[PDB]
């Protein structure tokens, strides 16, 4: 019943977007066609926050907060809120949209974590107060999708933990995104326009480079992104003979766990790509353009690449690594052929 | 006989600086008073390169590449070199300084890391060809400090590895830093200027925010930096029960390894602080200012916090975390006292 997505903050926004008549997966995320490889690597000394070279993929583009805001006409703002206002803010944003409330993994019992606050904070959506008097929270992640009840005393201790490693004390992402009367009638028109703009940015294939204290950040867009991602990922093939050793030292197991974590982050981004391309596809079908474009299935290609990364994460072989590369190259070729076909039909 | 530092790229620059008559630890690094805490956390979605909330410390400030280029009047440039121009580039750079040659860990046999390219690339300084035809490479890291012989065939194969996860194929940092005759007499004069400017920056205690595909990067200068660091590091005290536990999942074992790694990187930055503060002490004495600071020894307090961090790796418990926090606060209060007194004498 509740919407979900590979990224918890994305599925959370999908539930809030349904409150106000917006189809996030089809009209917002499906309207932003993007493909981007990113690298964090050594740049100019000093860069103290650069712990390791890191490469990942992203099909999010500008991201849903940028597109959801300018499409509906509203705002998506981050804010730290004092402890007394939180309940008032949660009740208030329910009118013009909703709230994404940040939480350590330790505070969500259904996540089972309990003994660790996670690497990154979690996100849930307050969904009113039950007749019981406790709060209803929606979990946006696909694995733990559904509604969960929390007492007000527990909700307030969760939003203000001590200690606070993730700095989430009273953190709130307010979604004032209820479109006006005319805006709701213009939704598919703007989705058609955003679909064309994203495909143009995709085929422009711009590059970029910035120097930060966390390292040099390189990114490449468009059809070249996934082939460039595959070529860079070949450098981590040393993990396969390493992981095959049960005769491992402590420091060596750190490199294995770090390399495995890099492929877990990649696997989640491949799952989002499949989720996004399926929304792009439901939008093309809704615009009455599926017949003109053809029967290409970029969402299924990204789904197979997602399965390959899952299989590589569970067991780091050279064959599983090579199987991920083939699934990624196939997904890249279907992507650029579908993008070129779809842009021509949109004129 | 061979210079070294806790950071390999810093010890490499110290050796190159000695070639041109510049004392890097005393004049360049010791003249840049700096103290800054850095945090990478969740910012505006999406941030695909943000893998974890991360906090670290840095006493490098602007860093040696900027200051070395400033005072000497030369340049420190990064550049990729084709395979047929690398040797001549290494020879031509030695006249005006030297080259920082980027390298995989498995390319340096003395590191005993043939199984992995390392989390980050390594840096060596070529020191010319030996009469037998082999190349001399200077290792700048304190634990492996020395000079190693490599064949020219192994040198070219090491500088152009395939695959190339760190993207160090023919990457060189050229140091054209030979000072002119008139400028060489101004070094200690310019070092006094840089020391006063650094102390002023440290007492301004500015803070900044930047949004970045790798997360939100926040920093804070000044005497508040180390106290603010201790307050954020308390969020990682969950690592004491999580480690030494036995029912570890693959994900929970990853949290322990990434937390252990966070304090390993922090231990190195503390080692640089003691190395940097000691360079200031030898700079204050030679400039004739040691009487104003009396017996204050921030180099001594930062060395103790470094040793307390080394003890935290061997045994990760609550008594060590509090001991590290204790030595961290003591080094912070000694720093601000030394800084205010030294800046006042410079009036």
């Amino acid at each position: 019943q509740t919407l979900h997505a590979p990224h918890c903050e994305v599925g959370c926004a999908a539930n809030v977007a349904r409150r106000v008549g917006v189809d996030l997966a089809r009209q917002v995320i499906g309207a932003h066609w993007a493909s981007r490889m990113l690298v964090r690597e050594v740049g100019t000394f000093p860069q103290p926050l650069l712990d390791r070279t890191q490469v990942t993929f992203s099909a999010q583009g500008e991201g849903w907060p940028a597109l959801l805001a300018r499409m509906t006409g509203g705002e998506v703002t981050s804010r730290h809120v004092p402890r007394e206002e939180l309940l008032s803010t949660l009740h208030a944003d329910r009118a013009e949209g909703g709230t994404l409330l940040f939480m350590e993994d330790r505070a969500c019992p259904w996540l089972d974590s309990a003994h660790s606050p996670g690497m990154l904070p979690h996100v849930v959506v307050p969904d009113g107060v039950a007749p019981d008097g406790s709060w209803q929270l929606i979990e946006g992640h696909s694995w733990w999708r559904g509604r969960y009840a929390m007492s007000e005393q527990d909700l307030l201790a969760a939003s203000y933990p001590d200690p606070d490693p993730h700095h989430v004390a009273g953190r709130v992402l307010s979604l004032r995104i209820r479109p006006s009367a005319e805006r709701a009638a213009q939704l598919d028109t703007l989705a058609r326009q955003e679909l064309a703009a994203g495909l143009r940015t995709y085929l422009a294939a711009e590059c970029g480079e910035t120097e930060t204290p966390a390292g040099r950040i390189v990114w490449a867009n468009g059809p070249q992104s996934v082939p460039l991602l595959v070529e860079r990922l070949r450098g981590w093939d040393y993990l396969c003979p390493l992981a095959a050793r049960n005769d491992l030292s402590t420091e060596h197991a750190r490199d294995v766990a770090l390399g495995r974590y890099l492929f877990l982050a990649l696997t989640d981004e491949l799952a989002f790509a499949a989720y996004a391309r399926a929304g792009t596809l439901r939008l093309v079908e809704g615009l009455g353009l599926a017949g003109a474009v053809g029967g290409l299935r970029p969402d299924e290609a990204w789904r197979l690449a997602w399965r390959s990364g899952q299989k590589l994460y569970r067991r780091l072989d050279r064959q599983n690594l090579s199987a991920l590369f083939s699934a990624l190259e196939k997904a890249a070729e279907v992507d650029v052929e579908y993008a070129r076909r779809l842009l021509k039909e949109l004129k």
Side-chain angles (χ1 to χ4, degrees), chain A:
Chain A
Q1 176 74 0
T2 58
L3 304 185
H4 59 94
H7 292 145
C8 48
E9 97 273 354
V10 169
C12 279
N15 288 284
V16 169
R18 177 158 72 169
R19 279 169 189 177
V20 299
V22 178
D23 193 321
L24 194 88
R26 168 174 68 77
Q27 302 181 294
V28 170
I29 302 208
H32 199 54
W33 178 286
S35 185
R36 173 183 290 216
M37 73 97 67
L38 299 101
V39 174
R40 210 167 38 106
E41 51 166 19
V42 167
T44 314
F45 307 118
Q47 289 168 330
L49 285 161
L50 167 68
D51 48 306
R52 43 121 173 180
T53 307
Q54 156 194 39
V55 57
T56 197
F57 174 80
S58 182
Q60 300 218 36
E62 305 188 57
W64 64 264
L67 276 99
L68 189 59
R70 85 186 172 220
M71 258 187 70
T72 73
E75 281 152 356
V76 170
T77 299
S78 211
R79 220 202 317 151
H80 287 104
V81 169
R83 188 191 196 112
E84 69 261 29
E85 292 185 5
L86 206 86
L87 310 174
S88 310
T89 315
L90 298 186
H91 280 117
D93 305 331
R94 187 43 185 99
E96 295 283 67
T99 312
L100 267 57
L101 164 74
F102 285 69
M103 225 171 280
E104 320 198 303
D105 283 20
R106 280 179 313 204
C108 310
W110 62 93
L111 288 179
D112 160 82
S113 67
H115 285 309
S116 66
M119 307 269 86
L120 299 168
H122 207 49
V123 159
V124 305
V125 173
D127 189 20
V129 177
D132 173 290
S134 72
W135 292 72
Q136 291 329 84
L137 315 166
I138 299 169
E139 170 64 56
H141 197 282
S142 297
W143 196 246
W144 305 274
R145 66 182 148 268
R147 292 167 103 252
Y148 304 91
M150 197 172 210
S151 92
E152 154 160 331
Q153 179 192 45
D154 292 329
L155 188 149
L156 283 157
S159 304
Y160 300 88
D162 198 275
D164 187 10
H166 300 321
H167 184 66
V168 299
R171 184 121 185 213
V172 152
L173 206 76
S174 281
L175 268 60
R176 179 226 165 281
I177 54 137
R178 186 175 288 282
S180 68
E182 308 99 288
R183 255 300 202 288
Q186 294 294 294
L187 278 188
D188 283 332
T189 289
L190 297 163
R192 194 190 231 274
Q193 266 150 22
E194 292 283 11
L195 187 53
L199 289 160
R200 277 185 218 111
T201 299
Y202 172 85
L203 288 166
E206 323 100 290
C207 297
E209 211 179 29
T210 58
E211 298 275 350
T212 83
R216 167 193 295 156
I217 294 165
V218 194
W219 55 267
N221 287 341
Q224 36 156 15
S225 57
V226 171
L228 289 176
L229 170 78
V230 160
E231 202 38 271
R232 177 70 81 132
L233 281 166
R234 274 183 216 285
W236 275 262
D237 59 353
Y238 72 100
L239 294 167
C240 305
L242 256 203
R245 279 136 62 119
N246 42 48
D247 175 23
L248 217 37
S249 99
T250 281
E251 200 83 358
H252 297 6
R254 214 257 326 282
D255 303 1
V256 166
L258 264 174
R260 202 201 287 289
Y261 190 37
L262 170 140
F263 280 106
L264 181 62
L266 182 59
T267 289
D268 295 335
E269 295 288 355
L270 305 194
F272 181 88
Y275 162 94
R277 299 295 190 262
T280 290
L281 250 65
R282 280 194 307 288
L283 176 66
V284 173
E285 256 74 356
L287 291 193
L289 292 166
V293 177
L296 284 177
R297 291 306 289 294
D299 60 325
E300 295 271 32
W302 280 108
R303 221 201 37 100
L304 288 168
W306 167 50
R307 287 319 180 174
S308 282
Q310 263 185 347
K311 182 181 184 184
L312 174 67
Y313 175 74
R314 276 145 198 167
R315 173 177 280 290
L316 284 170
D317 306 304
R318 46 183 197 89
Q319 300 98 326
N320 283 346
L321 187 58
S322 192
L324 173 65
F325 294 153
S326 308
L328 281 176
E329 286 149 1
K330 176 70 145 143
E333 268 163 74
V334 175
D335 252 17
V336 69
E337 180 68 15
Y338 185 90
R340 287 197 205 278
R341 278 172 190 212
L342 178 56
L343 185 48
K344 175 170 290 113
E345 288 301 324
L346 296 159
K347 280 94 181 51

